[PDB]
Nucleic acid binder design. Sequence first.
RNA 1: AAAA
RNA 2: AAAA
Lengths: 472, 485, 291
Amino acid sequence: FNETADKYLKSGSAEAELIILQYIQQDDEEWVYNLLEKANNPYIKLNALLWLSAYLTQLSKLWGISENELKSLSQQQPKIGLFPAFLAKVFVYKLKSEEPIALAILGDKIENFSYLAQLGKQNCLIGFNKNIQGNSWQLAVLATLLVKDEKIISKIAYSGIVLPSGEIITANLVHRIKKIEQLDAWLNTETIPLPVIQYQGEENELKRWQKAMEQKVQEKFSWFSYELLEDFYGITNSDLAIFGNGILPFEANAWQKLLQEQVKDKFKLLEDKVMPKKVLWFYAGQISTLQLGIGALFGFKRAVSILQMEFSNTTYHEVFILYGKENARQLKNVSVKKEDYQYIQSELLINEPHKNELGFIIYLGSHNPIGEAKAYCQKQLQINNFLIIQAREVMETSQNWLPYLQEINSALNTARQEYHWERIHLFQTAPTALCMALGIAVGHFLPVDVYHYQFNAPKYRCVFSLDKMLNL
Amino acid sequence: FNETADKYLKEAELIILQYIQQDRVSEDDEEWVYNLLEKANNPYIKLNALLWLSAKRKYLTQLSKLWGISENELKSLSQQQPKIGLFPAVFLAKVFVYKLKSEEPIALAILGDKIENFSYLAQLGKQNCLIGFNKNIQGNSWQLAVLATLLVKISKIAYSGIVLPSGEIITAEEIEYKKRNLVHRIKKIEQLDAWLNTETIPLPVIQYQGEENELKRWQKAMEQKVQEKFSWFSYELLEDFYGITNSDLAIFGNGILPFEANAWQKLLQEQVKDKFKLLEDKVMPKKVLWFYAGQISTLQLGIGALFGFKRAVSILQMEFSNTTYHEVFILYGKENARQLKNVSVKKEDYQYIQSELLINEPHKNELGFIIYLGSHNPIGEAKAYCQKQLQINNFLIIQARENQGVMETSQNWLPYLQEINSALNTARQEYHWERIHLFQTAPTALCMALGIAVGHFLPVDVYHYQFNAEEPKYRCVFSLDKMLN
Amino acid sequence: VHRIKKIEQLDAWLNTETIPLPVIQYQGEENELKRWQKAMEQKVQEKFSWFSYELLEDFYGITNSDLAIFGNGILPFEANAWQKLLQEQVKDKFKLLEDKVMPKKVLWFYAGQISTLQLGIGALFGFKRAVSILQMEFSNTTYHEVFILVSVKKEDYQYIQSELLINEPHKNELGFIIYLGSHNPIGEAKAYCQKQLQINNFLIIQARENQGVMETSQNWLPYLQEINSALNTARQEYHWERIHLFQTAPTALCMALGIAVGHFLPVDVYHYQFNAEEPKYRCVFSLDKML
RNA sequence: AAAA
RNA sequence: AAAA
C-alpha cells in the first residue's frame, strides 16, 4: 500500500512500478504527486497524471495548461502510435487550449514541443510507456495527430525527429519520410497508387523502369514514393514487378507458369495488403501478347491508369484512364456501329459458315500479321472465318486510346451477334497498353486462345487461352 | 432481519433479499435497513432497501436531501417499472432503470462501494434515472446497458462498455472473458441511438464464388456503401446486435461453381432459398432494407425469383472508376416499389431498350427470351443454341437502345426493367407460351431486378453461360417456375 | 385479460362499438404467416391503437390461426382441394367469428395471398359485412385500405378499359378476362378457352393507363364499380348461361369482386398454377355452386 | 454472360 | 395470376 508506494519511490525495481501502475489504473496523492516529478518510468508518470485528472490546480499552474482542459484528459480516449525503441507506444490525450501546448511527458522532464501541436492541428498531451532516449517519437505522435478516420494504427510504426518548420529527420516501419505533406496524404487519402510493372530481362533495367514509373506516379501523387510504399505496407519493388530473368521461352507451359506463379495472385494479394483503402492501379507492361492474359487476370473491376513504354526517353505516358467520374464502364461501350468508325476498320470474312471457329487478327502495331496469321489458320488450324481489325489512316501516344478498345470490342460483339463462334484465335500486333486494355475488356468470358509471335524463332504458337485464365 | 444484516456486516445476503422481497421486515429496523443501503457491498441489497424505503415512505426525506433528488421522484420510483439492461460480468448481470423527474440531472447509480451520480448519463439518455444492480461488479463497464435502456422509444441484446461525457463509448478489460449477442464494438452515441430507434435494419447481402479474402473485400465495400446512407451501420455492429455474421449475409461458395444444374440447384436450396426468410426472422419487429449485390448474373434471376417483389431492396451495381457501389435500383421509401411491376409502357414509348419479337413457328408455344444489356453479345450463341438444341424459332430479343454495354450507374435503372417487363407481357398478349428460355448478358443488379419482377409465375428456364466449359456452354441451370418446389 | 399494459387500451376494449377482425389467407410456412400477421397488426393499430393480437385472444379468444385461412405448403392443383379449402375453412369462418363478438359489430380487415381464391372467399364473405380490404405496399411494407366497403356508362370509364367480343353469337358461353396485375393472362386464357372450353365470346377488363400499377393510396371502389357496370352491361344485351372468369388482379381487388357478384351469377372461376404442367388453368370452383 |  |  502506502509503504509499498514509498519503497517503489526509493527503488528502481520494475515489479513495484508495474504494481503501482496497475493499482492506479484499477484505482496517498503526495506520493503520486512526487512520482509525477520523479519520472523514473514514463509509463508510471502518465498513469499518475490521469489519476490527478479525475493537485489539479498545482499541475495546471506548473505545466502551463488550463484546469477544465486538464480534467478533460481523464474523459478523453487516447490515440495510440507505435515507434521503435522493442516497439514503444505514444499516447495522445485530447486537450483544448488557445496557445498551442503539446505537453509531452518524458522520463527526463515534461516538455512542450509547441511546433508539434501546430503541425498536428490539435493541442494534445503526450504520454509514453518506457524510458526512451532521443526525439525519434516525433513522427508517431504527428501521424496519430494528422489521422482523420477513427481506427487503430498499430499495424504501422514510425520513427523520426520532426523539426519545427515541418520536416522530419531520420533517427512495418516508416522512417523514409521527409515532408509533412507526405505524411498527411499517406494517412488521409483513400486511393493508394499501386505501380505494377511487367518486365522480362535484366534486373537493372527493371530497376530504372520502376524509378521512372515512380516519377510518373508522383506526377499526379506527389506524396508517393517506393520507399514510402514499402514502409507503409511492405510492398517491395519485387512485390510489384512481374519479373523473370532472360528471354521467356516460346514454350506455352513457360508463359502459363509465369502467369500462375506471379500474375495470378499478385493483384488480389496487393489489394489485400491495402485493405481499407481503395487502389488506383498503375500498370505498364513489356511483352504485348502476355498482357492479354495479364489483363484477363486483372479484370474490369479495377480502376487503372495504363501507361505506354517509351524506349527513346525513359518516360511513361498514360494512355488508358479507367478511374474518375464513371470513366471505367466506357471501355466496355460496344455501341459503335461500323458506319461511325473513326479509328479502326474491320473486315469480317466468312467462307465456312457451318464452322464455329474464328481467327481474330489485329494489326494496330508495327509488323503486319495478317498474312502469317491467315496462313497459320488455313494450314495449322483449318480456319476460313477471319475477323481482321486494322487502322483506318502509328498510334499517337498523346491521345487517349479508349476509342480504339471501344471500337474493337464493338466490332467483336457485332460479329458475335449474328453468328456462333465456338473458338476464337487471337493473333495481334498491338501496343502493350492496348493489349492489356483488350484483355481487361474482353476478359476470360469469350473462348479466345492467344498466340504469341516471335521473329527470332513454328513462328506462331498458342500461348494461352482466355477462358482458362481462371484455371492457370 | 437485523441479526442477518449484522452478521453480513461482521448466505446472509440471500436471507435478507428473500425476506425483503416479501416485505416481511418492520419499520423499527427500517432506519437500520437504511444503514444497510449505505453499508452493503452488494448493490442489489442497497437497491432493494431504497425501494422498500420509497414504498414505506420512511426516512426518505434525509436520503432525498443528501442525494439531491426530489421527494416526488423518490416516491414515483416505488411504483415505477424498471427497464432492464444486460451487461457481462466477471455471467450476464442486469441493470435496473427507474424513471425520475428531478429538475437537476441525477442519474444516480447505486453501486456496491458508494453511490455516485453519473450526471452525464442523464444528459446522454435525456432522462433522470435511479440505476440499480444485482451483484457487486468491479469496474464501471455497465454504462452501455443503462444508456441503451435510456435511448429506447429487451433481453435479446446485451451491452458492454464505458461512456464518456462527450458521448463516446470505450470498452473495458476482460473483453475476451466477457465475450465468452453481446454489444461491445460500438463507440458513438449516435450509433447506439440509431441502432436502437431505427425502423429498418440494413441487411447487406452479397453473392460470391471464389476465395474468402475477396469476399471480405466485397463485404467491406458493401459496408461502406451502406454506411454512406446509414452512418451508424457496421458489420461488427450488425454481428453483435442481431447475431448476423458476414457468412450469413454471403451467398458464398469456394471456387468456380460446377457447370451442372444439380450444383446450381443445390446452391440455391442450401443457401439462397431460406436465407432471406431466416434473416428477416432474426430482425423480427423491424422492417428490412436489403442492400444487394451479386457476382454471377444468371444466378441472380433465381436469387431474385426467390427474393420476390415483397421485399424493399436497394440493388447496387459497382462503379469501377472509383470502386464504389451505386444504388441503381431503389425499391423502398417514397419511391414506390409498385413501379417495379409497371408494364404500362408501350413499344413506341421505349427510351432505353430496343425490343423485337420474331415468330417463325406460331404453332409451337415456345420462344427464346434473349436479353443483351451488357457488352458480350449472346444473341448469336443463344439463337444457335435454341435452333440446334431446343429446336426453337420464336424469339424475344431485347438490347439497349443507344449505348450498348454502358448503362449509367448514376441514373435509375428502373425504366430499363419496366420496359423489359412491358415488352415481355406484350409478347404474352396474343400468344400463349408453354415455355420461355432465358439467355442474358445483363448487369448483375438488373438481373436480380428482373428476377424479382418476373418471379416464379412464368415458365422460364434460365440458361447460364460458362466461360471455362466445352460446347455447348449454355445449360438450363434452373427454371423460374420450379423454385417454389 | 392478463397481458394488458396501458389502461387506455383496456378502456377502449370494453367501451367500443366495432371490433376489427383481421383475416388473412396464406399458404406456406407458418413462420412467414407470423410475419404477415404482424404487418397486418400495424395497419389495424393506425385506426385502433387499442387493438392487439394478444388482446384479441383474451376478451374473445380469437387466435392467429383462427383468423388465418392457412394451409401448409403450396395448395395442390386439384379442384376438390380448392372446394374442400373453401368449405372446410372459408365458408363457416365469417359466420362463426361474428358470433364470438356477438354484442358488438365487426369491421373486417382482409388481405389474401392467392388472387383466384379471393373470388370464392369474397363471394362467401357476403355483402352485408362492413370490410376494410387491405393491399400491402412493398416499398415500405405497409397495408393500405383500398376498399372501405353500378350503372356506369362505357364512355364514362375512368381507370378500366372494358372490351366485349362476340365472335360466335350462337353459344351462351362467355370468357370473363380481368387484367389488372402485370402478368398478361389474355394470351393464355384466350387459348385455354378455345382449345379446352370451346369459347370465343370474351369480356376483357383492362387498366386504362397504368397496367400493374394502381395507386395503393386511394379508394379502389371506383375500380370495382367499373367492372360491375361492364359485366352487367353484357348480360342485358346477351344472355350468358355460364361465364368463365380468368383474372390477373390484385388480391384485394378479387376479394371485393367476389362480394359484388357473389352467388348471383353463373360464373366459372379458373386458377393459374405456376408449378403445373399444361394446361395451367383449371376450374377450381363455380361461383354459383358454393351455395 | 463469374460484381455488365 | 401464390399478398398485383
